[PDB]
Design a binder for these strands. Structure first.
Ligand SMILES: Nc1ncnc2c1ncn2[C@@H]1O[C@H](COP(=O)(O)OP(=O)(O)O)[C@@H](O)[C@H]1O
Ligand SMILES: [Mg+2]
Ligand SMILES: [Zn+2]
Ligand SMILES: [Zn+2]
Lengths: 629, 581
DNA sequence: TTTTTTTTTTTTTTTTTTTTTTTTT
DNA sequence: AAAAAAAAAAAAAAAAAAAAAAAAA
């Protein structure tokens, strides 16, 4: 029975242990979700009770956890839900006892390291924590946020192993209510104060401190963002990395603080923190994170066959492209590029080659006048993918974009903290107003775009943080308008080296077309008075990341070589963006990305042709000329 | 000399037998109903308006204002004694602390009164008490009930402050209670339970947060109004400790009148000071018939009432009016704010209009040039908390930026995000957030695609000389200096207090663009596209039309925009662009 | 009661970052 | 007129030297 540090009326309450126990057992034995959707619950025989199947899964795998959805209790029994939310300390042990009794009644010969402990989650979301009140103290709450930082493991004692200094008699005292009762008298030889505590022979659990930024959906006027402190105990340590977006369900704890870390006097004001009970990484408004892809049992066989059938349609690429940001009108090439960025290229291992890491992400630079719908795409992608980040040029600095050092104002220790770029390690960094960026902070992006690492060497520590980010940059033409009198490269106003890093530079220009203006006006007005669903695109991308690992073929290789030679000839002009060897690599990624859309698992002529076509359409190479302009 | 049992009797008499006819000539025993509501746990704060007390007992009010904490405690205890005889039914156990209270009472060296109140009381300063300037609140007014006006510069976050600590013993099962008055307290280590005292046990008792009593707590610093600072001095700031139902009432930048108690916190016996808030009121712009509103010309009247002393500029004021009203946000997320930049030659009353909007808009900030730059606009990290700048304080308001052209280049870049993204993405060394600034920017500058492409309206003002036009203006201005009031006209201009209500009344009127006007708007938009092409108009211009058209729809308070608004919205575009030419 | 170790506070300096300013194309 | 490099501001962290108070025996 692993003790959980997270945790007739008992006292001043409305709960009797037997009543809660029986009610929870009943709920566990006869609960069926009526509107349960087969896809929403994968690998679960819907007709039969859900949580009994959960217990069967526990028996099979052995994970001694039961993710119980608080909404299920809410629907089945609101009084039990009230008891649980109001008194998590008392209710959760009762639920643990109930589930253990149920799971040892059936399957009486199962073997587990410890008993099974329930983890309520999806409690009624607290939109903004600031709205929390002292009346909401020591109660279960669910919030949503982004993890700024996670601290190293802290070992917390649970059993003190004492030994007599004289006779060496060993006894194990157990934590009572946050304190350990030192024997003060040996039981063996009866010598007084001969029992000394022994640290390394004692028993310890884990405790991890996580500083988390909340994204409250209720944002009153003038309210600044809010960061809070979470504690993860004995299994949830390092279940969330910095940058992860989580829904944290836990007990709202308020604890005393000593005016000094040494004197016993405490301020009248407490300070609150959450003891994590459950992490939920799933969100219906975003794609699947890397962890969700990692676990195999996420796609029901029917859903897998549905995705396979989708991949066989000729318009799979165009259907997927049309799905991104439906409120943005006829940006087909740009949406295709963003799709290829979301799919990403093959992650290859080049350690044996002695070459170092190879960038498999895709960086897209949208160069266009401020009027054009540039920032909308960046914000949408930032509000679409997980582990995404956003920046606005002059609002950032190099150190803040890479890493810094600060005194943690809860342990008073100088620790290193990550930057915006690192937080999006396996996500996307949307750099808006890229042009309005001082060269100092711009210089950093070179390594993050080529090596995918960030080698800091500062007094604090010398080390290289791995950042596999994909950069989605947006830039304005010099003079804030794409005057057709100046050449392309001159108009972009960025160093050639940097533009070489980007594998897709989309020029968003305003063609003075009456039909386009009329259609766009229709679209915008319709929007002002108002497909392929999210649930299918999200699953398609997750599956493609999980399984598809495209490998180049002979014809694809030959086509790539010829395309690179043609690019070198074409871009050899004066004003056009010159083509470098680094561009060939870009094509590969793009090709692979397209090969990943079709679930081909092998790049062939069509994929390379599509990559070349998309690259040429970008930069408007067809609409350009040797006399660039 | 000063008994308190008689005072308890007097306050009980006042509470039981005071009445008013507020609700349509109905004597209703003002405070009896409040007591009944308190006993039913449907109301947590009992504001004892001292004006009521003075109506029938001037000496009691004099004593109360001459000594605050004593009479606050007396009123609290009197309400406690009166609660039992006014309760009419059984409460439904609103919160957990009520359940604990009932269990303690049923199981019943006494329960401290503060542990079983669950009801707060606060004094509203008597009208005869003139509000006092912060600078003049000195030793002579320590413990008195004073009212002071100021600007909330910085308010801390709501935190639970413990009033009565509750411990449980490991042996006797009895509860130990400790009232808290000092900012810090010594936790009790041994239980004084009479059973353990008799038994002579260890009595090591553990603090329980389940039974303890917590109250909302917030700390704020409020400044002095610029109108009351001495000539050669700077505004003075005073600390206010709000608690209970006085939290989450005031945000930074809110003009607030606070009536509390000037009490010192013990550290000769030098002692700091603060105000224990009792009544917080939001004043002026922060403050919280129909026949004229239904008029056809009501749209013109508000416009003509914006800075009447500023002659002419009929069209500009009509455009600023829309900025105050703002468009309507649509989330298919497109902002509903309107950004107007007044560019012109020197001395064309650009700043005066910018200053006037500040004194009118509910939430506003007026930053001039490089006086408040950098972190002045955006936020900064100041435990380390985050403090917002003018934009954040102006969030969901109107940030009046003067001399936008001469602004720091970084600040201009920050604004670019705000007027399109309505956020402030910071990734500095110590700061990594994404603020929320849904503020309408009102920029003033002097003579630009880098700026034209962004603002929906770029009004250009030129005071080109003219014999008769200047003469009219001189008559207007010289009149203002002669009577201090704008020249009389056919209609009396609306007061700012009245205007704020009207504009606010129009905000919660989200209208809709009918399909019928789509062809008209599309037809109008395409023409606007060609004029710039023939002679800048992008997709932004169509949005500017829609936002402006909705703004007019709110003014007429029609939930459906009509073709007249589009014409009027375009007409403003015509003049705005024609101002450039 | 008398010591002792801590607690503070009161100055001062030092280091990183940011911002502001100066010089050059 | 705008970008690049330098200088200064300013804020946070560290040393530390000394005087006073709380806990221990
Ligand atoms: N149209 C006008 N009507 C009335 N007063 C005006 C007008 N234009 C300028 N003024 C006067 O000029 C003075 C300075 O104006 P100011 O707002 O500084 O001009 P700007 O800011 O446009 O340079 C103000 O006191 C104002 O009374
Ligand atoms: Mg001016
Ligand atoms: Zn022994
Ligand atoms: Zn006891």
């Amino acid at each position: 029975v692993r003790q959980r540090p997270d945790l007739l009326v008992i006292w001043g309450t409305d709960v009797n242990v037997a009543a809660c126990k029986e009610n929870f057992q009943r709920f566990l034995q006869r609960f069926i979700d009526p509107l349960a959707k087969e896809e929403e619950n994968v690998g679960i025989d819907i007709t039969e009770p859900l949580y009994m199947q959960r217990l069967g899964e526990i028996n099979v795998i052995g994970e001694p956890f039961l993710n119980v959805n608080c909404e299920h209790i809410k629907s089945f029994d609101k009084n039990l839900y009230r008891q649980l939310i109001s008194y998590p300390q008392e209710v959760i042990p009762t639920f643990d006892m109930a589930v253990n009794e149920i799971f040892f009644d059936r399957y009486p010969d199962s073997i587990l390291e410890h008993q099974i402990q329930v983890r309520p989650f999806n409690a009624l979301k607290t939109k903004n924590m600031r709205n929390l009140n002292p009346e909401d103290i020591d109660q279960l709450i669910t919030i949503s946020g982004m993890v700024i930082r996670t601290s190293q493991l802290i070992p917390e004692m649970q059993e003190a192993f004492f030994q007599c200094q004289v006779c060496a008699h060993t006894t194990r005292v157990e934590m009572d209510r946050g304190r350990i009762a030192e024997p003060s008298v040996c039981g063996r030889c009866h010598t007084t104060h001969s029992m000394a505590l022994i640290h390394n022979r004692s028993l310890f659990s884990d405790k991890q401190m996580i500083k988390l930024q909340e994204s409250p959906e209720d944002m009153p006027a003038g309210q600044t963002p809010h960061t809070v402190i979470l504690f993860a105990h004995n299994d949830l340590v390092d279940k969330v990395q910095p940058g992860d977006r989580v829904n944290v369900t836990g007990i709202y704890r308020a604890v005393p603080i000593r005016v000094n870390p040494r004197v016993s006097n405490v301020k009248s004001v407490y300070k609150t923190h959450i003891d994590v009970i459950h992490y939920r990484k799933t969100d219906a408004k975003r794609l699947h994170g890397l962890d969700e892809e990692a676990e195999q049992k996420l796609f029901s066989e029917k859903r897998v066959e549905l995705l396979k059938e989708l991949s066989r349609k000729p318009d799979i690429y165009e259907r997927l492209a049309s799905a991104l940001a439906p409120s943005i009108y006829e940006h087909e090439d740009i949406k295709k590029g963003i799709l290829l960025q979301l799919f990403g290229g093959t992650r290859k291992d080049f350690s044996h080659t002695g070459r170092g890491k190879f960038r498999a992400e895709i960086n897209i630079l949208l160069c266009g006048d401020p009027g054009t719908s540039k920032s909308q795409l960046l914000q949408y992608v930032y509000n679409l993918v997980p582990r995404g980040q956003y920046t606005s040029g002059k609002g950032s600095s190099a150190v803040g974009l890479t890493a810094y050092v600060m005194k943690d104002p809860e342990t008073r220790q100088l620790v290193l903290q990550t930057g915006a770029l690192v937080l999006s390690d396996n996500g996307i960094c949307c750099i808006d107003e890229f042009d309005k960026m001082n060269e100092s902070t711009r210089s950093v992006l070179h390594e993050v775009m080529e090596q995918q690492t960030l080698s800091i060497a500062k007094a604090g520590i010398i080390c290289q943080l791995n950042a596999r980010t994909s950069v989605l940059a947006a830039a304005n033409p010099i003079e804030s308008q794409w005057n057709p009198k100046k050449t392309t490269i001159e108009n972009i106003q960025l160093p050639h080296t940097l533009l070489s890093r980007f594998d897709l530079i989309f020029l968003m220009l305003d063609p003075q077309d009456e039909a386009y203006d009329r259609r766009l006006a229709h679209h915008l007005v319709a929007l002002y008075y108002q497909l392929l669903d999210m649930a299918v695109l999200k699953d398609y991308i997750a599956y493609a990341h999980s399984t598809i690992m495209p490998r180049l073929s002979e014809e694809a290789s030959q086509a790539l070589i010829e395309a690179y030679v043609d690019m070198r000839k074409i871009g050899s002009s004066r004003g056009m963006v010159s083509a470098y060897p680094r561009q060939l690599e870009s094509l590969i990624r793009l090709a692979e990305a397209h090969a990943k859309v079709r679930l081909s698992n092998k790049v062939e002529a069509i994929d390379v042709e599509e990559a070349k076509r998309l690259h040429r359409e970008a930069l408007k190479q067809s609409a350009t000329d040797p006399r660039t302009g | 000399l000063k008994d308190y049992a008689l005072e308890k009797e007097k306050v009980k008499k006042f509470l039981q037998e005071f009445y008013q006819d507020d609700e349509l000539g109905k004597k209703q025993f003002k405070y009896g109903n409040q007591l009944v509501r308190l006993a039913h746990r449907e109301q947590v704060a009992l504001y004892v308006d001292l004006d009521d007390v003075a109506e029938d007992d001037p000496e009691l009010v004099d004593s109360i204002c001459e000594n605050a904490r004593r009479y606050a405690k007396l009123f609290a205890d009197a309400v406690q004694e009166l609660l039992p005889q006014y309760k009419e039914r059984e409460v439904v156990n609103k919160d957990v602390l009520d359940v604990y209270i009932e269990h303690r009472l049923m199981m019943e060296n006494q329960y401290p009164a503060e542990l079983m109140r669950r009801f707060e009381l606060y004094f509203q300063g008597p009208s005869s008490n003139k509000p006092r300037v912060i600078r003049e609140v000195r030793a002579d007014s320590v413990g008195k009930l004073v009212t002071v006006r100021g600007i909330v510069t910085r308010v801390s976050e709501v935190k639970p402050k413990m009033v009565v600590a509750t411990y449980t013993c490991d042996q006797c099962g009895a509860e130990t209670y400790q009232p808290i008055q000092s900012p810090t307290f010594m936790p009790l280590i041994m239980c004084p339970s009479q059973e353990c005292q008799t038994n002579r046990s260890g009595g090591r008792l553990y603090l329980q947060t389940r039974g303890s009593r917590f109250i909302k707590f917030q700390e704020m610093k409020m400044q002095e109004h610029s109108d009351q600072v001495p000539v050669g001095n700077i505004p003075r700031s005073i600390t206010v400790l709000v608690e209970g139902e006085n939290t989450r009432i005031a945000q930074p930048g809110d003009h607030v009148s606070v009536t509390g108690i000037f009490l010192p916190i013990l550290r000769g016996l030098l002692s700091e000071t603060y105000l224990e808030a009792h009544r917080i009121v939001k004043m002026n712009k922060s403050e919280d018939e129909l026949r004229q509103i239904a008029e056809e010309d009501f749209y013109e009247k508000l416009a003509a009432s914006i800075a009447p002393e500023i002659y002419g500029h009929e069209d500009v004021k009509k455009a600023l009016l829309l900025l105050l009203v703002g468009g309507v946000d649509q989330s298919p997320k497109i902002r509903g704010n309107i950004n107007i930049c007044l560019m012109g030659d020197p001395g064309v009353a650009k700043s005066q209009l910018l200053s006037y909007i500040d004194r009118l808009a509910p939430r506003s900030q007026y930053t001039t040039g490089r006086g408040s730059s950098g972190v002045g606009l955006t936020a900064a990290v100041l435990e380390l908390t985050l403090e917002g700048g003018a934009l954040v304080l102006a969030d969901q308001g109107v940030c009046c930026i003067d001399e936008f052209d001469k602004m720091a280049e970084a600040d201009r870049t920050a604004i670019h995000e705000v007027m399109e993204q309505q956020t402030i993405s910071i990734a500095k060394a110590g700061i990594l957030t994404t603020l929320n600034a849904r503020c309408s920017i009102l920029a003033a500058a002097n003579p630009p695609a880098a700026l034209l492409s962004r603002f929906d309206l770029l009004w250009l003002i030129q005071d080109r000389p003219d014999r008769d036009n200047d003469l009219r203006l001189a008559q207007h201005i010289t009149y203002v200096h002669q009577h201090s009031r704008q020249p009389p006209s056919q209609f009396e201009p609306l007061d700012m207090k009245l205007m704020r209500r009207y504009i606010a009344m129009c905000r919660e009127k989200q209208p809709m663009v009918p399909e019928s006007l789509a062809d008209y708007i599309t037809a109008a938009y395409v023409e606007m596209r060609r004029e710039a092409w023939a002679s800048y108009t992008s997709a932004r211009t169509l949005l500017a039309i829609l936002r402006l058209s909705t703004a007019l729809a709110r003014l007429r308070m029609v939930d459906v925009v009509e073709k007249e608004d589009v014409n009027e919205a375009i007409r403003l575009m015509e003049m705005s662009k024609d101002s450039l030419l």
